[PDB]
């Protein structure tokens, strides 16, 4: 049995976990931040101009994590550490 | 057993994890953004015209994640990295 | 700044809870607590024992339209 096969299977499972967690986090965080933004705009129609500043920060902090995970996921499947 | 068997089993499990995470994130984020939109429209019926602008953004930032996962899931299942 | 009926801060206790108003606070209508106290800070802070008042924050102005004894003590600092 090829050890590289086992290592690749493990890497694929790890990458799947990475991307699943990243997707959950990004989706729920974006939903929560957008809920805040939508409620704020509903109460103050003219407030959007300023509410987009913190909102983009929140998304910036959320998507960041996501896209870091994605990066590491690419480091799992395409260049697998420990793969001989 | 052929190495391709183990690699493909791992790829399928990873794709399943990716889809599960993406669906959780998309569903919950869209539900939260909705909740916000419905509450806003209930409070200010006329606000709907503007409320759909930020809402879509949120949904976008959610759906993107999901759909991005989708792409990688295909990359896992149809062209498995590390396949022998 | 904001026009209190000029100040920098308006601390008050409403039925919901302690509330502080700054110059661009959102429009608001609230009921001051039965023993409410108002502290208006301007460029010393003025302390008022307000009983059964109503707070009304607008785009520009903030209008403050045993319980009375407690309000008096809180205004004069004994709490």
């Amino acid at each position: 049995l090829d050890p590289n096969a086992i290592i690749t299977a493990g890497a694929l499972i790890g990458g799947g976990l990475i991307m699943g967690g990243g997707a959950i986090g990004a989706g729920i965080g974006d939903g929560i931040a957008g809920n805040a933004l939508i409620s704020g705009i509903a109460r103050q129609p003219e407030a959007q101009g300023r509410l987009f500043t913190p909102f983009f920060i929140t998304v910036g902090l959320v998507e960041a994590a996501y896209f870091i995970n994605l990066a590491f996921m690419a480091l799992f499947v395409f260049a697998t550490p420990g793969l001989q | 057993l052929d190495p391709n068997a183990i690699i493909t089993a791992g790829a399928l499990i990873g794709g399943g994890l990716i889809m599960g995470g993406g669906a959780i994130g998309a569903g919950i984020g869209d539900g939260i953004a909705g909740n916000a939109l419905i509450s806003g429209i209930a409070r200010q019926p006329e606000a709907q015209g503007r409320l759909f602008t930020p809402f879509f953004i949120t949904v976008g930032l959610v759906e993107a994640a999901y759909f991005i996962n989708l792409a990688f899931m295909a990359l896992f299942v149809f062209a498995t990295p590390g396949l022998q | 700044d904001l026009n209190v009926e000029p100040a920098t801060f308006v601390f008050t206790r409403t039925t919901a809870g302690e509330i502080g108003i700054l110059p661009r606070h959102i429009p608001l209508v609230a009921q001051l607590v039965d023993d409410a106290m108002v502290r208006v800070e301007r460029e010393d802070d003025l302390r008022i024992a307000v009983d059964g008042g109503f707070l009304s924050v607008t785009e520009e102005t903030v209008r403050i339209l045993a319980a009375w004894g407690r309000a008096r003590l809180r205004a004069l600092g004994q709490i």
Binding site: - | - | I26, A30, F54, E59
Partner: peptide, 30 residues
């Protein structure tokens, strides 16, 4: 004030939306 409460409250007592610390109905009552 009372007009603002009535506009955004149920009339059943026997641009920017005003925020009401408790519900609008209780403020309307008092």
């Amino acid at each position: 004030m009372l007009t603002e409460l009535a506009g955004a409250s149920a009339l059943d007592h026997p641009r920017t939306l005003y925020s009401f610390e408790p519900d609008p109905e209780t403020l309307f009552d008092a």
